[PDB]
Each structure stands twice: as structure tokens, then as C-alpha cells.
């Protein structure tokens, strides 16, 4: 037939070119406006079609309908038309091959609507001369409109949007469209420009909001070369039948060769690796063969609905349909879980979904049939409200909490009022660019360049930050409020090839030609980090800056089934058909995972521990079983939670938390004690905690949200502190009781020196890579020239020499004094997680055990009888117990609010009779904490308000350099956020890695890789403004202090 099936553009497979036809796919958006319904000028390439922009180019404004007396054809902006049979005996028609569209008869012409959209298109203007009907408007069910106005001689001159926006089209004497201008409330802004070759084919397309592109054509009127005009281009060569055989981009990117045969298309790279398609007579892809092997197969209904998918290992996903509706009723996963759907009879709109656990959700619909909330499985309704224009003005939860929105006369959102009656106010330029935002008495403003990109930001503090974009919209330079410049450079495809710090040091990147994945990083000291890719683009080996290597192997479907490190340790993985990890094999044994029908973990079994979980209804966890204890969460209410810990000398601990309708803790209650009240500001920051007639804490914040003061005590000595900040928001000074400390920083915000009363206490220097290593003094003098081996691995630190393992772990530490004999500290790493495993100091050994999540469970020393056990409530401890000679010394129950300690209870046991009795069981004592921003506890207070413990004096990077005060036994054991102190070794325990304070570094390389950061052994850039709470990736403690160009 003289037709081609319509495809939805998500069912098409591309290389470089549509594999099924050898046809170039180009589709570019040039304008985008409007608030209620969108006004979008989009153009696409279809060589044998015409419209605005001349031969070959067609666009959203030139859609039309044709009617051959009883059949109607709609010419959409895709490569094919829609066909409908509409006799004079019928009001509406549907075609099973594109069942989303319905065509209905109109007053004059036809009306086309897509099921899941509110917008309908009216082809109701006769073109004077099958019969051609022009597009005349779009209309919402809300009677919003977008009107197309034609002059005499049937040119489109204007497009009017009922909100306000309004476009004028302009033509030259040859009728060629040359410009589109926005002509709206005395505006004259030019929105796009077009230029043509002498033959009238489109030569250029300059778009204010988008890109400037150029086009060249071969002698057969087919595209030969498009370019950015600066560094990007792709080149195309064609066969005698119009099909594309070769493509090459700039820089050697995307090199493809295509071979065509009837039913089969194979595409090959310059290396000879070949992908193979198969497709059926409807141009639906049936098999894909990848170059490493592996065959994926698809099977279709007679109307081209996908019914079955088989992955190359045999995972089979099946579907079933409601005969001709095109509506899916069952989806069966490869694990056998069945999902079920049902639809309304009169109109094919979803009335219910059932999941494999027999929970049912019911969608709800307003008048005009637009969604209006849902009924949850519990029977609890959520509702929505809409103004006369269809904009959501109210949303409501079954608790009665509600969120409210208000709209300008141009239907722009101008005020958002949230569930806690905090308000945000917005402001707009005449061109609808977001000009202003008022959030909490802080006012933000922005200015824009001629391409509608942010030029200047004007912060609440009256500071100016400047942005410079290239013509393509890549942020080439950022200038912060100190005038330091951060710069980054872009290559052939807006891939960044280099970036330069404010100190001026430069980094470089290299990309894979076939896939544009990152394959190399060059250090400012010339060291290199590298990936090697498979034929399928999988990473099969990576190599570290120091030259450590890892190797991987994969299965047919793409899962990773083996890892080999450089110590010859082979880790293996087995997966279920849903790609969940199901077994882990290690030199130390198997670990087994078990799941339910829905993907919820029920049991992890491991060489030395077992975890169990139970869930209740809303996928809250209600029980956990761990080694050493249990947790039982009650949840009596939507805004309450009660936790009980049972451990065992049987012990129990209870707490209750209450929440302020927006998720923030506002009260804490410990069983035997009067409650603690937490106050919240309009930004949700904690401004104070108090116990009635007792402890009170008060805190102040700047308009940039940084903490500027703390005061605490028996309000009616405590702590009394102040902070000062730079204009780039680095901390410059801190003071307590007048003892001011001063920090000075280089052009990276790294502390050069610490002065405390004009005396210099500490100073530091940094190398070209940012490692906090070169001459430094905190407690001893560290020299810079013997600090590192080959790749930021430690060589000499004072009188200690370090030896490293073949796998890049630290293996020994040697105190080579030359006056004393050998002192050796030994570490015994395992393989599952580079867990420390064991340690031998100058004498007595110590051993550690871990859970199945990487969370330490024990710490034992058999020689002296010391054991420490831990119970965990998530990413932070819940209970700690400490034993010697088989009896308790201490127990700590701890409550956290984020990474910041809020309260602590402690019982202290001691035998006094020297008889087999656990004597003098003491009384629980509650302490309330005051903490620094980066998570270090500063002081602890009695509920009555008396201070009972105070932090010793401390170095920038954590070294203790004062003495212990009163009550050293009440020290919680916490350092920066996420870390615990090990006094036997002087190491700070992060979850996945161990930190050495004396060297500012971790003992082992990053568990993830370059995702964690470019610096594999560095802890953090600045201990006073960053935290690293898991061992994986550092983050800013305050928002608005983040680097906007990236790092």
C-alpha cells in the first residue's frame, strides 16, 4: 500500500539513523512558551515533504488534514500519517493500529484528540482550492485556546495564546519565512532567524533559546553535514537508494558502517564489532544481537502490541491486552509476580490497579475526567482542586493537611503556601523569566543575558556572583563573590576536556569514541586513572593512579559475575531473574539473600551473622533482628513513632518522637524523663531546645542559613560562641568566652593557617592536587619532600614509615627511630569489603567482626578480656555495650536527629563485693548535647542545665591537643559526622573506611571509585565546611555554600 505504519518514536532503534530503513532522524525545538497549554515550534526532517522552512523541513505549525470523501488522513510531524475511516453514518472513529487517537467530526472540519492528553486539535478551516483542512486552533477541555490567524493569501501571520504570549511571523518577497518575533505588550524581541541557500534549501537556523546550526546538502538533496559552526559536526554518506551507509562525527566520535539485507541490518565499528538487527514486515524489531553475543527477542500481537520479551538469559516478561482497546490488563514479571489492571467500560480510563500483594489503588477523576486524587489501599482519600483554568489550587491529604497555590492574571504561579503556613513569593519579568524569589525574609534576584540565561545572581547578603555562558549554554566561567574565577573548557560535543581551579591547577579528561563514556583522567601532576572497555562497552579492568588493578567478568545479560583484585582474590555473584543479588561467594564463604514477591528484603544470611526483617502494610519496618538485640517500632499515629530496644543481663530502652506535619522532629520523650521541645524557624532550622524549668539552648542563623551564634545553659558557665564568615561563606573566625580563633584561606577555601590570639598555632600547605600534605605543623613538624610514594600513598610521616599492600591497602607502620628497636603495627585485611579484619600493635592482638551491611558488630581482645558490641538503628548507633573479663562496664543508649547527637543515656555497673554478683547496678543518667555544624559534640548538659562534660581542645584535622576535663567517662565517642574513635589504634572508624588523623588520609582506596571523587585517599577538602559520613563522598554542611560550576 501507498503508506507506512505510524511508530511512536520509542519503538525505533537508532545508531550513530533508523536501522529499519536507513533514514536520518532529526527533530529540533526552536521556541517554547505558555503556561496553561504549550506553544512549541518544532521542526523535523522528512526529505519528500514540505511546509514552512521549505523543501524537506516540516513543522508543528503546518499540520493539516485531507479527506478523500470517506477516508481522512492526518499528516503529523512524524515520518508517517494517521489514517481513519469516517463514513457519514458515524460520529467517531478509531483505528486499531494507532488506538490512542480518536478522530471526531466537527462543525466544519475534523477534531483529533489523544486519549491521555487534555489538548484537542481543530482542523476546521477550509483551504480554498481530496479537500485540505488547515489547523486553526488547539483547545483544552478547560476552554483555554491557542489561535492561529491567517491573512488573505493563506500565510500564517500570528499565533495568539489566551494567557498573553503572542508571536508574529515575517516573510520575504519570495514567501520564505525569515524571522519569528514576539509581539506582546509592546515587546519586539526576535525569537528565531532563518537563512536559505540559493536553491532555497534551509542553510541556517539561529534560535535565541537554543542552538545555532548549519546545514549542507549533496547533489541528490540529502543532508551531508550539520555543524554547530564551532567544533561539532557529523558527516553522512549514502547509497544509491537513499539509505545511509557511513557516519563520522568530529573528533572521531560515533563511527558506524551499516550493511543492509532484506529483514536484517548489521552495523559495524572500525574495529569490526558488529550489532545485528532483525525486523518484521511492520518494521518492528524482532531480534537484537550484540557484538559480545547475547540475543534479545520480542513478539507481537497482530496490531503490534508487545506481548512477550525474552532477555538473553531467558528472563521472560509477558503481557495481556483488552482485545482491541490497546490497554494492558496483566503484566507478569520474570519472577512470576502478577500485576493486574482494570478499566472503565464507557471510556478506557484506569479505574484500578492490583499489585502482587493484593493491595488495590483506585484512581479518582473530576468532571472533564482529569485526575483528582486517589483512594489508597487503606481506604484513605487524597483530593485535588482546580481553578476555572485547570490549574491546581489546592491539594489535600486525608489528615486534612493542605497545600495552596495562587496565580497571576497571566496564570503564572506567584505564591505557594505549604502545609505549615510558610509562604514563598515569586516575581516575574515581563518576558516571564523568574526575576525574584522571597523565601523567608531573604530576597533573591537574578539578571539574564540576551539568550535568557542567568548572567548575575544578587544574593540576600548584597553580594554579586557572575556567570559566563558560551553560545551553546555551557557554563564556561563562574566568578564567586571574592572574585576568584573557576573555569572549565568544552570539546567537540560539549564534553568537558579540562577544568581549572581558582588556584589555577588544571585537570584533563578523555572519552571513548564509540560510547562517549569517560575513560581517562589526568592528574595535575600527570598521573593517570584509566578504564578499559569491552566490545559491549563494559568496564573489564580499571587502573588506579598508583597502578593498582581490578578485573571484572560479565554474563550474557550484563550482570557482573566475578571480581578479581590484585591480591588474587576472586569474588563471585549470583543473581535472580529480577537482577537482585541472591548469592555472594567469597574466600570466607557464602552470603544468601531472600526476598518476597514484592522487592523487600526479608533475610540476609552471612558467614557470621543473620538479619531478619518484618514489614507492616505501608512498608514500614516493624521488627529487625540483629546480632546482640532487636528493634520494635510501633507507630501509633501518622505523626508519632515509638522505638523499643531489647538486648541480652536484660536491658530495655524506650523513646518517642513527634513530627510537625512537614517531617521535622519537634518533640523527643525518653521513658522516665520530662519531654524536650524543639523549635523550628520558617526555613525549618532548629532555633532552640528547652526543658521547662531546665536546660535551654538558643541558636541564631544568617539570611544565608549559616549558624552565627550559640548560647546554652540554665538561662533563668555554659557555652557561648560566635562565628564569622567570609563573603564566599568560608568560616573565618570562631570565638568562645572571647578566645577568638582565626582562619586564613587560600583561593580554594583551604585553611592556610590557624591563629589564636595573634599567635600562630598551626599552618598548612597543599600540593598541586589538593592533598592536605606538604609542610604542616599541628603538634609535630611534617616535611614535604618525602611525604608520598608515586600516587599519594604515604612514605614518611615524621618518624613513621608506611608499607602498602599489592591491593593498595596499608599493610604495616614502622617507627624507624634508629635509637629504639623495631616497632611494627600490622593490619590483616579480608576481601569482602576491605574490612580491617584484625590488628596487631606492639604486643596484644585485636579482632573485629562485621554485619552483612558493613556495620561493625564487635571489637574483641582475648588477651585482656575486652569486648565491645554494637546495635544499630540505621546509619547511626542505637546501643553500645562495653565489657571486660565478662562483665559490663558501661552501656550507652543514643538518639540522633540526622548526623547530630541529641541525647544520651548511660548506666554504669561495677562489682563492689568481689563476688559473682553484678553489683551496684546504677541509675540511668540523661545528658542533652550541644554540637558543632560538622557534627562534633561540644558540650553535654544535665536536664537541670548544669554542664557535665566539655570537649578538649582539638586540631584542625582532629588530633587532640589538650587534656581531659571532668567526667571523661561521659564522652560519647563521636568525632566528625559518621565517625567513631578507636583508642587502641588512634583511628577514626567510618562505616566503609578507616581514617588516620595524623595523615589526613584513609588507609584504603575508595570502595566505589571515581564516583566518590577524583582524590582516592583524601578525606575531605576542608574539615570546617564539609563532612564525609559514610566514607564514600564528601558534601557541604550548608547549602548556598556549594560550588556552582561544580568542583
Author numbering: 272 to 287, 290 to 402, 409 to 927, 943 to 1010, 1027 to 1357
Structure paper excerpt:
We recently described and characterized Tre23, a toxin domain fused to a T6SS-associated Rhs protein in Photorhabdus laumondii, Rhs1. Recently, we characterized a new toxin domain associated to a Rhs element in Photorhabdus laumondii. This Rhs1 toxin, encoded by the plu0353 gene, is delivered by the T6SS, through interactions with VgrG (Plu0355) and the Eag chaperone (EagR, Plu0354). Tre23 inhibits protein synthesis through ADP-ribosylation of helix 44 of the ribosomal 23 S RNA, hence preventing protein elongation by blocking the GTPase-associated center.
The Rhs1-EagR complex was purified from E. coli overproducing FLAG-tagged Rhs1 and Strep-tagged EagR by Streptag affinity followed by size-exclusion chromatography. In order to prevent Rhs1 autocleavage, a catalytic-null mutant, D1338N (see below), was used. In the high-resolution cryo-EM densities obtained, we could build de novo an atomic model of Rhs1Shell from amino acids (aa) 272 to 1357. Rhs1Shell is composed of a continuous strip of antiparallel sheets (residues 420-1262) defining a hollow barrel, which is closed on each side by two plugs (residues 272–420 and 1263-1357 respectively). The C-terminal plug is deeply embedded in the Rhs1 β-barrel and tightly closes one side of the barrel. The N-terminal plug caps the other side of the Rhs1 β-barrel but remains at the exterior. It is composed of an Immunoglobulin-like (Ig-like) domain (336–421) preceded by a small extended domain sealing it to the Rhs1 β-barrel. The β-barrel and the two plugs define a central cavity of ~28,000 Å3 in volume. In this cavity, densities are visible but not well resolved, confirming that the C-terminal toxin domain is encapsulated into the Rhs1 β-barrel but suggesting that it is highly flexible and/or partially unfolded.
